[PDB]
């Protein structure tokens with residue numbers, strides 16, 4: 001047959017603090033979890049890798065009752081326990097498979113599980129590939145498999161996305177080591193749900209749990225056998241010997257009215273997911289400013305999250321309906337104190353404030369004018385300068401909105417020298433009145 | 444073996460030869476706005492509901508830069524040097540007598556270059572640092588002449604600083620009927636100042652390999 | 656004394672050194688030239704194609720220590736770039752945004768073996784292929800081979816002998 | 819061999835490139851704002867032209 005186990009074969013790429021990148025397996029990773037760091041190009045990939053590692057640690061702690069300690073590699077009696085059930089982490093097996101299901105008759109290309117790599121219909125620019133001729137190696141397939149429970153888009157027919165529907169912002173606390181990283185985000189619950197990757201589909205009740213929530217399977221998936229060859233994959237590009245070229249994917253809807261609060265999610269007012277409203281075109285009620293870091297810094301800092309826990313890390317995936325738009329991440333130094341709610345709510349309205357800035361015309365015409373488009377060209381540079389002092393801005397420990405208003409002064413003069421180029425006297429007064437534009441905080 | 448694939452690149456390995464850079468003006472941008480009104484052919488004389496709109500336009504003196512790789516073009520044609528020379532001449536004509544099609548049915552800015560300089564050198568360079576000071580117009584000059592003068596000063600400084608090392612540079616300054624010479628004296632700032640596009644294409648072609 | 660370090664001047668009207676956060680449509684410069692960016696410029700200087708460079712030329716070139724000094728830190732400007740599909744077959748138009756660094760200057764120092772540095776400096780005086788700054792629509796405004804090499808010391812010392 | 823072509827071209831009041839809003843495309847150089855015609859706009863005009871088709 002074909003043998004490929006998660007623990008036995010190297011499929012996790014890390015970098016040690018001595019500067020040596022490497023690819024290692026699961027057993028070596030948690031053996032030396034205090035001496036390396038996960039290194040993935042796409043931030044969502046390393047986020048889902050950390051989430052799966054945390055879920056596995058939660059299950060093993062639930063079945064060993066050992067709490068991990070900081071600066072340790074890992075708690076003892078975890079590697080032998082994972083070696084006890086090594087047959088459960090099976091891929092390309094016979095009857096037991098990991099994160100897979102029954103062989104549905106529908107056949108799809110292996111590139112559907114990867115968002116950045118285009119699939120059938122749409123376009124194929126920025127990634128020159130074709131279906132069924134370009135495949136995935138023995139690690140990128142598991143990369144795509146681990147991305148299922150948290151980054152599943154709505155899609156076309158088959159609207160049902162997953163346990164979070166539209167993927168929201170994912171916020172979590174950072175560290176400098178993998179064993180250290182797990183300590184900050186170690187929050188055991190009252191009940192550790194039920195396993196959802198133990199080879200059981202496990203139809204549960206309305207109330208679900210952590211081990212059944214972090215390992216959701218919104219789509220039935222079955223990977224075909226490897227094909228001999230020499231070409232590299234379309235995701236990481238390393239030449240190999242075997243590749244996977246097709247899969248069996250068919251959509252499945254979650255039961256309606258499920259109760260599940262994501263530990264790393266952000267919700268607006270009624271459980272609706274707070275996504276990233278970043279697009280490419282500037283239209284009415286939106287001026288493109290990039291780096292929507294200010295948007296989720298209210299809801300996450302309002303429900304048992306008003307601590308420091310080191311530094312914060314935001315992972316934001318933006319998409320409309322089925323089409324994916326962007327993925328980015330932001331680090332924030334968050335070793336400050338508490339903040340007043342009003343100023344923080346004003347901070348989490350910068351998109352509307354900047355749109356109101358841009359929509360104001362030059363001399364006053366109203367109707368439906370686009371305002372001054374030359375202001376919209378200088379906004380993404382001034383917002384990148386403000387984001388340098390993003391830790392001080394949130395908690396008002398040395399920064400403020402009125403402090404950030406002075407960044408636009410250096411560039412609005414250069415805009416005004418172009419908008420009112422006359423050397424007369426009324427032009428000077430017009431420039432002086434135009435220079436004074438500042439964003440207005442509204443709720 | 445088409446010219447449109449070898450020179451420009453793939454339709455939509457096959458590495459091309461062109462290096463069309465962004466065209467950047469030589470002075471302060473002066474955006475202007477227009478308050479148009481969508482008038483109604485039927486008089487009506489009722490229900491006004493003002494149709495005031497806004498459309499932005501500008502006028503500028505652009506400095507445009509192009510590069511052509513001769514070895515890459517020859518490898519793309521695999522040896523047809525006459526075809527390579529013909530494609531270079533065709534691009535020299537086209538890039539001089541072609542304008543973008545954006546909003547030309549309402550503004551009709553069908554203008555022509557006021558001076559083209561063709562150079563041959565080992566290292567690449569762009570004379571964008573010449574217009575680090577925006578061009579200010581004076582009484583006995585216009586914008587075009589001052590831009591050409593700043594280009595002449597930068598070329599003079601470069602040939603005073605970056606020259607010799609067993610590598611002389613060659614210029615082929617052109618201007619319509621020689622109305623805009625590139626500087627005065629200083630060995631005319633380049634080689635022959637000629638006043639016809641066909642003569643410029645012929646001069647470059649006969650310099651490259653003595654082509655037709 | 657045999658040369659030790661090599662100096663590269665990167666300055667143009669527009670330039671862009673892309674980063675890993677550019678995944679779908681929005682393409683962003685990071686803040687400064689990267690090691691992978693300058694080691695495509697050096698590879699295109701000595702005429703090494705995309706193939707045959709990974710197995711031989713890249714491992715020797717990646718064994719270097721480089722540092723970038725920043726003057727005129729640059730103003731990020733965004734560009735609305737549309738790619739016309741058609742003019743699969745459809746009349747659709749793809750939209751994207753691309754970021755550029757306007758009015759920037761970077762000094763790169765690469766330190767390593769002497770004869771490798773000498774070969775690199777000999778290649779840069781007459782590059783085999785066209786040399787740009789990140790994207791092909793961005794040519795340099797000052798010559799890349801503008802500063803001479805030398806038997807200097809560690810990168811902080813090598814980033815001080817340029818005015 | 820590397821042929822380089824430099825051109826100086828003054829244009830009538832027009833709008834040859836646009837953002838997503840409608841203004842002419844601009845850039846920053848030397849401490850002021852400068853009108854800019856993009857690189858991919860110029861390459862599209864040179865290509866697919868009647869001069870380049872004849």
Ligand SMILES: [Zn+2]
Pocket residue numbers: 136137139140233234235236237238
């Ligand atoms: Zn791969």
